[PDB]
């Protein structure tokens, strides 16, 4: 199922809910052990991890260094070692069972820093920084390479993307997206890097484009019916699900589904309540 963790709806949230695209109904599971929005989620070894973010509450606004692990058949969260720095609006990707935490902000500071988590060792290690400071960055893994896409450097929103090579431990700028996107949904469907929605500094976007590594080309595809940034994104049985977000006026509960064979989007569900800035993964 599609798990959604955290989010924001007048305050950061502890929610963990799971959607079943076949049956169409929502499970309510154990609450996070610190309310978080702007976090990222991934799955390693069937375990669901919640990385970074912040607790924006009536009483504070603390950026998060936490990594927390949910066990789907224990329905219980347990803490893992923290990161070197807090990373609000972080991006994460999974290569070879290891979690990469990318970018994000701590207060005024927009990180270019990147670090790696070792599940069976529960250790973080600092690795080569990005060429670019990026928060609200989308991250994706293709051919065991790590891509950092778009985001916001503190001044400009970005259409640039760069690529991290784990065996060189090095970055490389690649071709820029056609659209400036911060807070987009970035994932890997079929064999392209998809970038859906986001915010270009003026409007939330409903456009969607995908990167083909072999031709180093971004192409536009079917756009979503609703503009959104700070959305959750995941692919389930070969189709893209985008989850909540913000359109400049309301917090979306709309969940859209992109069919790559028809190049069409359709609304399949509404989340239990509108929210933005969630961590999403499937397990």
């Amino acid at each position: 199922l599609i798990y959604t963790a955290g989010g924001y709806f007048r305050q950061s949230l502890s929610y963990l809910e799971a959607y079943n695209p076949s049956d169409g109904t929502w499970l309510r599971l154990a609450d996070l052990q610190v309310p978080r929005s702007g976090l990222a989620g991934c799955v390693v070894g069937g375990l669901l991890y919640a990385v970074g973010g912040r607790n924006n509450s009536p009483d504070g606004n603390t950026d998060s260094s936490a990594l927390d692990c949910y066990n789907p058949m224990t329905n219980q969260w347990s803490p893992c070692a923290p990161m070197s720095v807090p990373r609000n609006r972080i991006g994460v990707g999974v290569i070879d069972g290891h979690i990469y935490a990318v970018g994000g902000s701590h207060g005024c500071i927009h990180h270019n820093s990147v670090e790696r988590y070792e599940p069976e060792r529960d250790e973080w290690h600092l690795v080569a920084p990005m060429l670019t400071r990026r928060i609200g960055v989308g991250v994706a893994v293709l051919n065991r390479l790590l891509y950092a896409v778009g985001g916001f450097d503190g001044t400009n929103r970005l259409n640039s993307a760069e690529c991290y090579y784990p065996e060189r431990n090095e970055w490389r700028m690649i071709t820029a997206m056609n659209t400036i996107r911060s807070g987009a949904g970035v994932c890997v469907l079929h064999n392209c890097i998809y970038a859906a929605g986001g915010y270009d500094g003026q409007d939330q976007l409903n456009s969607v484009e995908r990167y083909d590594v072999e031709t180093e080309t971004w192409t536009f595809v079917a756009p979503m019916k609703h503009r959104r940034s700070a959305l959750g994104i995941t692919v389930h049985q070969g189709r893209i699900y985008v989850l909540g977000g913000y359109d400049g006026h309301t917090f979306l509960d709309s969940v859209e589904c992109y069919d790559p064979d028809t190049d069409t989007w359709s609304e399949v569900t509404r989340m239990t309540s509108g929210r933005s800035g969630v961590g999403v993964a499937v397990t």
Partner: peptide, 6 residues
């Protein structure tokens, strides 16, 4: 803020 509503 325009991006996260947060």
């Amino acid at each position: 803020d325009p991006e996260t509503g947060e």
